[PDB]
Amino acid sequence: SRKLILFIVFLALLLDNMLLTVVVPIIPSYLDLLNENVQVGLLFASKATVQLITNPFIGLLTNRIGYPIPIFAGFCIMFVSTIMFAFSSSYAFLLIARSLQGIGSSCSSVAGMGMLASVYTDDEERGNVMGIALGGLAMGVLVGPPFGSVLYEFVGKTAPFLVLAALVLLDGAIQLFVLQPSRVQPESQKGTPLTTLLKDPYILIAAGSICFANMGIAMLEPALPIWMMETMCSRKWQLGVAFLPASISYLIGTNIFGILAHKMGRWLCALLGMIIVGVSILCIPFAKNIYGLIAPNFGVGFAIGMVDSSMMPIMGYLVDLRHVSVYGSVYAIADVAFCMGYAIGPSAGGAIAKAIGFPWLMTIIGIIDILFAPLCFFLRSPP
Ligand SMILES: COc1cc2c(cc1OC)[C@@H]1CC(=O)[C@@H](CC(C)C)CN1CC2
């Protein structure tokens, strides 16, 4: 049934973000409050840029041959990424494995969201199922850091990666049992061209909303006071703890608020999420140390869950209303906007760091978010 596809997408994004985020206890092994590292900048941005580039081709590919085959391709390349990643002694091998993992993340996310939207035609529980998928993303990024840390500090370096690989194999067994991509299943009608879809005001407004929210995240994580040379208290706790607040708030907000955002007015959800994101990003620089950095994360993650659960079903619904019922290209647009923030995070952050200080960057990012928030009013009554 439909819930089975929902579970497939849930666990696919769960394992995807688990593999994405389990790296954090391992990044220290390779070599005022907020500072950037050029070594982690390429590590943080190579996956994002590769996945950025790889998105629209996969959208067209799902439009061409079907949904399950790209998901199984995501299985194959994520498994080979884990295999080449556990043994990745060198930094170049690490970057190449991250790029392969990015291709896998692109196909998994785009195809899963597209088929989840296609099977769930009506918008009443469409928001619910996209909220559940994003909750799977949040749960994966929540369980990543501490699982990786305990497996690294109790067994060894390769043990978390091998255990995650076994979990991926169980996932792929489930995929083969469920989707069965035995034959190519072409779509009934040709989809709306990607270039024509970018000539749309509302789609671009939603894409900019998601891009600015994820940029609000992405300008902070590579610059967190983590993964230095050494620590007085040996650190090793912040590595597994620092992503608890944002992930917990994302999970809670998305899961509890998708249905109520459908009820109350989803443009209102977008606007409130943008306002709270701006407030949180603007109040990050007013923190003396990492002691006070925990509080604004609970707000920024909550509001970015708001934005994601309030714009991904709109990405589906705008094309459902004003275009043909083909979702691959529009969800490729949604995800390319979703990841452009992470892709341009390190370079833009470093340039603006060389120019001015970080607190001014946080204030200007919050100002842009606040000024862009009223533009979500245009989505109340789309023709
Ligand atoms: C290794 O660098 C990464 C670090 C982190 C993430 C992804 C990364 O890979 C680029 C995820 C992914 C997201 O989407 C964000 C979740 C927010 C919105 C709660 C941020 N988290 C947490 C930290």
Author numbering: 18 to 48, 123 to 474
Question: What text appears in the publication on this structure?
Answer:
VMAT2 inhibitors reserpine and tetrabenazine are used to treat hypertension, movement disorders associated with Huntington’s Disease and Tardive Dyskinesia. Here we present cryo-EM structures of human apo VMAT2 in addition to states bound to serotonin, tetrabenazine, and reserpine. These structures collectively capture three states, namely the lumen-facing, occluded, and cytosol-facing conformations.
We incubated VMAT2 with TBZ prior to vitrification, and obtained a 3.37 Å resolution VMAT2T map. A rod-like density in the central translocation funnel permits good fitting of a TBZ molecule, which was also supported by the overall stable molecular dynamics (MD) simulation trajectories. In our structure, VMAT2T adopts an occluded state, displaying concerted movements in the luminal halves of TM1, TM2, TM7, TM8 and TM10 compared with VMAT2A. Remarkably, beyond a rigid body rocking between the N- and C-domain, a unique transformation of helix-to-loop occurred at TM2 and TM7. Specifically, the last three helical turns (Residues 313–323) of TM7 unwound at Pro313 and stretched into an unstructured loop (LuL7–8), swinging towards TM1 and TM2 of the N-domain to block the luminal exit. Similarly, the luminal three helical turns of TM2 (Residues 124–132) unraveled from a hinge residue, Gly132, and ran along the newly exposed electronegative cleft after TM7’s relocation. This rearrangement latched the C-domain by buckling Leu124/Leu125 side-chains into a hydrophobic cavity occupied by TM7 apical residues Leu315 and Trp318. TBZ is situated just below the central plane of the translocation funnel. Its high binding affinity (60 nM) to VMAT2 corresponds to its occupation within an enlarged hydrophobic/electronegative pocket formed by TM1, TM2, TM4, TM5, TM7, TM8, TM10, and TM11. Mutational substitutions including Y341A, F429A, Y433A, I308A and I395A, had varying impacts on TBZ’s binding and inhibition activity against VMAT2. This robust non-polar network positions the sole tertiary amine of TBZ close to the negatively charged Glu312 on TM7. In the TBZ-bound VMAT2 structure, the carbonyl oxygen is oriented towards Asn34 on TM1.
